[PDB]
């Protein structure tokens, strides 16, 4: 421990304490907006799936990861990547789509050749149905007529709690017509080709609206922890400095007096 070293770490933790403090505030505004924009978007998602739950849909014989770009949000990108790699080995042909750069980097090296499309700038600007539609367009423009898929995302619960959730997407138009669909009448083969396409854009948007609410909340959290872990570390080293300042003055003085009291 030295006066040069001590103050260097005090100079830099008073940085982190503040840098982290504003990153809590930045995320705190983005949470409060994402919490309001989720309130309707939930009802929207509720009404979107209210058909696949009321009438059972199976498949006789596509993985979508939803997170963001900006990290430091605790364990948002890492919780969905765990449940993606869980199904990457458990299954059958598996083709992956990752929304948010932090899926192209966290679970890439392992499944580098199993990529279909990648999406950036997620979590910078609050998501829209317009963003979900670009996700819907690119999926249907690719020559991958998928049998069945599942979308994995972070569902919001509260300021601190969230859970990684799967939702199966029966978006194969060949799978749209099952024995449970025989209950329904007055349908076209190519009117489901319209409905299935749109109900896909809904659930993508819903998962995206849940994610950016669950993401900014735990970044607000992680940074409120980190800024007040630095607040504690400042208050700890500062009085460690005083110890070492007073002791250096005292010790430099004994060193003189000892030399004066020998002549």
């Amino acid at each position: 421990a030295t006066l040069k070293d001590i103050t260097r770490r005090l100079k830099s933790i008073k940085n982190i304490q503040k840098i982290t403090k504003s990153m809590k505030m930045v995320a705190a505004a983005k949470y409060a907006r994402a919490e309001r924009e989720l309130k309707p978007a939930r009802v929207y998602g509720v009404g979107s799936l209210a058909l696949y739950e009321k009438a059972d849909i199976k498949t006789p014989e596509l993985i979508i990861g939803v997170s963001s770009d900006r990290g430091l949000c605790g364990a948002i990108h890492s919780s969905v990547a765990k449940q993606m790699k869980s199904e990457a080995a458990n299954l059958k042909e598996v083709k992956i789509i990752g929304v948010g750069d932090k899926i192209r980097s966290i679970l890439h090296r392992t499944h580098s050749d199993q990529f279909l499309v990648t999406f950036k700038e997620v979590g910078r600007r609050p998501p829209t149905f317009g963003d979900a539609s670009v996700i819907a367009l690119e999926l249907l423009n690719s020559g991958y007529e998928f049998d069945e898929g599942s979308i994995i995302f972070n569902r919001f619960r509260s300021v601190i709690s969230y859970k990684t959730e799967e939702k199966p997407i029966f978006s194969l138009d060949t799978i749209s017509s099952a024995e449970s669909m025989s209950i329904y009448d007055d349908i076209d083969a190519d009117v489901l080709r319209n409905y299935q396409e749109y109900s896909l854009a809904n659930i993508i948007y819903y998962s995206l609206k849940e994610s950016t609410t669950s993401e900014q909340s735990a970044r607000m959290t992680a940074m409120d922890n980190a800024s007040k872990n630095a607040s504690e570390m400042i208050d700890k080293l500062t009085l460690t400095f005083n110890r070492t300042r007073q002791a250096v003055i005292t010790k430099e003085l004994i060193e003189i007096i000892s030399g004066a009291a020998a002549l």
């Binding site: 505030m25 930045v26 505004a29 005083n242 007073q246 003055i249 005292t250 003085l253």
Partner: protein, 310 residues
């Protein structure tokens, strides 16, 4: 703040004051001299003066700087015992009194104690600070300006001084830049007599209520700047608007500063303050505007100001 304190003790309690400048810069000595005449406390003509000035300047040897705090205390001691007053004693600054005494002990040839200070530090402080108390005849109450070295509160100088300190008055830039005068930090200044047993049952709960309502204001500051003002609950919207009216009522115009400000000076009696703040906390003035409580005496002058024109 010093001069107003001199005025208001002489006014309210009929007690004189003594300024003992330990390590006074001669420029600041001259500047403080005319500031006291220009405001009213020193009267170069008649006998209406309220202060005795003692100057231990910097360009004087450690002996003079170490003993002037006594030369001031002794002039103040006359007005305690001989005229039975509630005296006021200013020391500015107390650290330069400690450093004065360290130099002396260093000069005589005494082996230095911790952090370079004198071995006699405890007593060097005790033999002076124990003359400043309430006697049977009168009392001397001392305001001491403190310099903390390396902003280190554990440094023996402020550490030895704090053992004798009953209350603090923090004059802050932050509060002064907002416009609140005197520039006192309401949460940063603390007192030993903040006890229901000493001041009273009412005084305590009203002070603490004001203390809590300002902390809550700080506690909601980040929620104010980054969430949306109109999304606080009824009880959170209310305490914010009530809290702003509290820190404005702390503001007070000063008599001493009539020559500068041009506005009338105020001496707010004790119970006027207690009930004044109690009513704002109870919400009795939830309808009045913010600018109403700014730079006013009692609560009466605040409601009258609230009228203005519209």
């Amino acid at each position: 703040l010093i001069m107003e304190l001199i005025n208001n003790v002489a006014k309210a309690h009929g007690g004189y004051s003594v300024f003992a400048g330990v390590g006074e810069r001669t420029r600041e000595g001259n500047d403080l001299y005319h500031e006291m005449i220009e405001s009213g406390v020193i009267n170069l003509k008649d006998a209406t003066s309220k202060v005795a000035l003692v100057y231990g300047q910097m360009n004087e040897p450690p002996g003079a700087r170490a003993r002037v705090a006594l030369t001031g205390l002794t002039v103040a001691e006359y007005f305690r015992d001989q005229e039975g007053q509630d005296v006021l004693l200013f020391i500015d600054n107390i650290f330069r009194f400690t450093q004065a005494g360290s130099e002396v002990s260093a000069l005589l040839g005494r082996i230095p104690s911790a952090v370079g200070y004198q071995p006699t530090l405890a007593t060097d402080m005790g033999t002076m600070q124990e003359r400043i108390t309430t006697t049977k005849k009168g009392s001397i109450t001392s305001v001491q300006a403190i310099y903390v070295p390396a902003d280190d509160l554990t440094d023996p100088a402020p550490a030895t001084t704090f053992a004798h300190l009953d209350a603090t008055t923090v004059l802050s830039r932050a509060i002064a830049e907002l416009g609140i005068y005197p520039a006192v930090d309401p949460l940063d200044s603390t007192s030993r007599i903040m006890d229901p047993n000493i001041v009273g049952s009412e005084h305590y709960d009203v002070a603490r209520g004001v203390q809590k309502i300002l902390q809550d204001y700080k506690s909601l500051q980040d929620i104010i700047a980054i969430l949306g003002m109109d999304e606080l609950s009824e009880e959170d919207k209310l305490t914010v608007s009530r809290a702003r009216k509290i820190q404005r009522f702390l503001s007070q115009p000063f008599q001493v500063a009539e020559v500068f400000t041009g506005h009338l000076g105020k001496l707010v009696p004790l119970k006027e303050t207690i009930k004044g703040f109690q009513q704002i906390l109870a919400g009795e003035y939830d309808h009045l505007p913010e600018q109403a409580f700014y730079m006013v005496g009692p609560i009466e002058e605040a409601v009258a100001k609230a009228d203005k024109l519209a």
